[PDB]
Amino acid sequence: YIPDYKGMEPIGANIEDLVDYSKDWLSRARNFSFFEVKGTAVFECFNSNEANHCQRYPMSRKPRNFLLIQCSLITSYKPATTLSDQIDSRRACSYILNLIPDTPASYLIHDMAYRYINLTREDMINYYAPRIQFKQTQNVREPGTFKLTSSMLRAESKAMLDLLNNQIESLNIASHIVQSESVSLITKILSDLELNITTVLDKFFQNETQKYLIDVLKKTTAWHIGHLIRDITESLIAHSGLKRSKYWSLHSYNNGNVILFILPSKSLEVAGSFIRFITVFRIGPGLVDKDNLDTILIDGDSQWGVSKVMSIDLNRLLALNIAFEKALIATATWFQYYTEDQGQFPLQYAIRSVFANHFLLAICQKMKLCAIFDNLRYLIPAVTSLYSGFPSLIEKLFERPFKSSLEVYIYYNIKSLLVALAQNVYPSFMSRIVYKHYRSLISEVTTCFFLFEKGLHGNMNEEAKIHLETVEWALKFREKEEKYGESLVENGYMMWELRANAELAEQQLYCQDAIELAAIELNKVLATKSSVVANSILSKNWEEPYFSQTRNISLKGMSGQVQEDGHLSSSVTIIEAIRYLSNSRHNPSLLKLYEETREQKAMARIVRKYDRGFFITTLPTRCRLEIIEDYYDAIAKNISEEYISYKILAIQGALEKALRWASGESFIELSNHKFIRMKRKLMYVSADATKWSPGDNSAKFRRFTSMLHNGLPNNKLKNCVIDALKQVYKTDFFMSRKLRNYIDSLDPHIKQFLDFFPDGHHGEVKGNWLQGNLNKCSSLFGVAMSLLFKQVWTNLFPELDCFFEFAHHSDDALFIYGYLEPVDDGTDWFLFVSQQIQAGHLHWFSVNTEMWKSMFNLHEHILLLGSIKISPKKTTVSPTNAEFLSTFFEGCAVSIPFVKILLGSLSDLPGLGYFDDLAAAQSRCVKALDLGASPQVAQLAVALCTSKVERLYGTAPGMVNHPAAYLQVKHTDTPIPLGGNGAMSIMELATAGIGMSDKNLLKRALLGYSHKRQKSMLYILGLFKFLMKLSDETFQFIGKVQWKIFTEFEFADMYTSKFLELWSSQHVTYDYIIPKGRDNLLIYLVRKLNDPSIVTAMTMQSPLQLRFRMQAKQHMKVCRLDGEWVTFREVLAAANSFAENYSATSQDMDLFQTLTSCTYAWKDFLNGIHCDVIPTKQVQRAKVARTFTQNSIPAVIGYKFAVTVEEMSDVLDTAKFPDSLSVDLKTMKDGVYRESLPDVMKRIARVVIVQGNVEGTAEAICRYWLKSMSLVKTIRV
């Protein structure tokens, strides 16, 4: 049912009025929005911005520090163990004691070393024993700590502690001396870091990756420095616990050459806590910043550098712990990109220098460098294009002050690189190589950008920036509304109003005539496809229940109810769905929910920490946005073949028309019949016209929806969409408590931001839909207005044969303007222009020279007739350029660079247990391999991730939790949940999946017991049976050891757990499909809250409650066994005992046989495929996305266990064809019988970026992956 919803009345809009206005507009001189690049222009822009920056910020003489941990290495480094730690600590304390301190930091250092050296044997035994053997003593209260009362502490040392317990300036960038000093320092550091210290996939890896990358980087100083920093950060993390952060600690590494002194600090579990330490090292080559060192104590024929008290937060610590892996993966990505670019391996010096630069970037995680690289990502294309917004970007480069010497060196390198690029083979950024294609340079800068953790973003400065941006645009909207009236701003102005004012053409101010004409131009195309438009609109299923869909019960994040304190509650979508279902009496449809929540105001907030991009909104706002998005996505999919890319063929189709039109030549007629030969040229603009802008007006869409012609017979749905757009007009923006407290704890901008809120917890914002999902609506509007500009231009110059073709993919948009230039370069064209301008065609003044400039000016103005503004910065216009088109097509093709997923895998883990996070790490590297990563790079990433996971859980050989110590089976043949080699290969993981090791093992084990009846095969079967027993004990693959999960929600305990288990057992069908009714959907959603895999996702960013909460237990009692919390060693021993006495049974054999039978012959293909190399140079092709692959599978399974009328009706409703369901079962069971009982059925139960040659078959994808195994040499399968 659709209610009457007023609707809108059509107005009389004539294209001739717009054409006349365009004539009047073009009759005068207009300025261009972009500046020509010349090299000199970029250099003067840099100089002027340098002078302005020097004037703006106060000048400082002493640069700040940038090395969080300073250390030096002369010899090779071996990982630190307990006995090595003992010997190192003793030697280091002796070395410190023989010295003479100078400053309070040195006095504290000497005092702590002297206190450590005088500990008794009992304390030393307890200082290094694990928790099991640990005993509290007088001087040692926690495993790796000791106390320090005031008595041993000196007066000065205490001074440091009291100073610890108890304006903005920048460097002189314009000065040549500061730049020279910073460049010299960073060059010294980098040169020290580069100094040397003194299956078939395996074959290809050892031939290429292990030889030219890992063998080269194995001997460098940066490799061992990264390992040393990993050890130091591991020791710091071990000290960040709740019970250990209160006391001091001392550690040593590298034969007594590096020492770490940990001071008392607030535990990192509570947010905003900094672990404080002092690092003391013998001064030598490496991460040494002598100026920023606290002291340099003198020793005979030696120097000992003592750093200042370094405070490192949580995310910085976690980033430093994985800095070496991030640097290695970035270097591997650069290695792959170099091989792609040039076809030859990088030499020694190039690889060493790029690895040193990546390591230095990964060590120093600073906001300034992250912003600098983010800006450079767009600065590079803007400098290679004929015209662009480069000054706006160069001005953005100086937003923040330059504090450390690292920022000055990076800025100097960027300035040199940009000036070299604009003068124009493209120079590199951290080496002496010139790339053949600048896409390699863009990828290099992108890899550098992704080396910075996505936790740096946010802070309290970024949230303030986005808040002030929103408030500034809201205040601008209020000013415009009071200046022109409420009605004119909301409903838009008319053509004659704009003609009279000649100013209303601005942002947050649209023209009704423009909207109507754009809708008419869209309807021109839309009329021929009315039937399919109506079918697609009706196919959105507006009648199905709202909360039974997956998008409405996800973890997206929505605003809750307003509280008594007046602040909006951030919460989860599923929680709000549960709340509504509990308060409601049914499960309403989309339109019914909109009817119920039409009167409620739209409230909005900002996500706490997950943050500028997510304006979380309440349920009614989401419902209205979903109505509008469903309608506009339904009507917009039909013209996706030509204008709205979702796709590549549309962009290819537009370019083909442009090139063909340019190939043909044109003649213009004359009154004297003297045809004039015109040369056709093309100009390409890469504009981000359709991004969401804070300054905008949603109300325009109303009129658009009023005139957009669908095939529906009634106007009920159109009026409903218009009413939803009307209700999403006004919103109640809410202050975040963090920002409120930060501001409460004087600036005029802050003052005016405060007056924007009457009550200090909320203020009204109008016309800004606050980043809500209206992407399809915005893209459709942009396409319609581009078509309107095309029509206006064709009406403006009928005699001229100009060309305009546009494509809109996501936020980016490509405009191609085909213009006419004189061939003879004579005055005949200007003579004709003069004749036309004298004949009354005054608008021909702007066509005299540079027709494409006037074309773009008119296009930008026509877009401005709405709220669309082509961003001055970030738009780049170039002639017909193969590289430009190639990078545009690549950015349209490679949606996400694989290096983002690669670095992300080491940065975050689920922490649900060894198997779970190992699977997640292996899955992320597989997804990156899908995204375009070379198999060798993905194999390297897999190795690094698996090694990190093994280090975390002590599974690697020669560690406490090694399965081979007790399980009497080889580490390779051990099941994955108990520690299992868990390495395999990237090909096996990508093709088969992320669990094949267990089945292959089980399968062979079954065979090993079926034919030879060997004892070890029976042992493996016993281990598998033990895992199945543990899984049976655990409540909702073969079997998983349960690991402790640390917690918490409003409705998470609405029903008892035993009732949930009983309901899940009784209503089996709801496990496979979602229950439509409210009384059962409520219980299903409550069950979804208690799922362990979801709680870890809601709190995955919790400050330590997840990040180090379980990186602390590691070797404690965290596993579940026999209803007890026990150590992993105890679980391994229990598994060994169970498997030793396990006796084979017929039922277990049947279960194992069924599981093996259930688990495409992907492994068999990889064994049977043959690959032989050919001596032929590799060729790089365009990147293209492919897919790797009657009733739905769950519906038939859901139908199988249907026992009541409600369940059977629900499985009808969710199924596409509810009639065929029985037939499916009727055959499916027979198939099972040829391969029934409930339990057997219960246990029975990808976009890939490739080259253009690859087909859409999964075998073709696997063959391509096999071909891409060699970075230089081609392969034949």
Residue numbers in the entry: 226 to 391, 401 to 432, 449 to 674, 700 to 885, 891 to 926, 931 to 1029, 1033 to 1323, 1332 to 1342, ...
Task: Give the text the authors published on this PDB structure.
Cryo-EM image analysis led to the determination an HTNV-LD97A apo structure at 3.3 Å resolution, revealing the organization of the polymerase core that is globally conserved compared to the one of other sNSV polymerases determined as far. In the apo conformation, a positively charged pocket is present between the vRBL, the finger, and the core lobe in a conformation suitable to bind the 5′vRNA end. A positively charged groove is also present at the polymerase surface between the vRBL and the thumb-ring, suggesting that it might correspond to the 3′vRNA secondary binding site. The apo structure adopts an inactive conformation that involves substantial folding rearrangement of polymerase motifs. A global comparison reveals that the motif E adopts an unusual α-helical configuration in the apo map and switches to the canonical β-hairpin strand structure upon 5′vRNA binding. The observed folding of motif E as an α-helix has a significant impact in the relative position of the thumb and the palm, which induces a differential placement of canonical motifs and inactivity of the polymerase. Of particular significance is the conformation of HTNV-L in its apo form, that had, to our knowledge, never been observed for any viral RdRp.
Hantaviruses are causing life-threatening zoonotic infections in humans. HTNV-LD97A core consists of a central region containing the canonical palm, finger and thumb domains of RNA-dependent RNA-polymerases (RdRp) that together form the central cavity containing the active site.
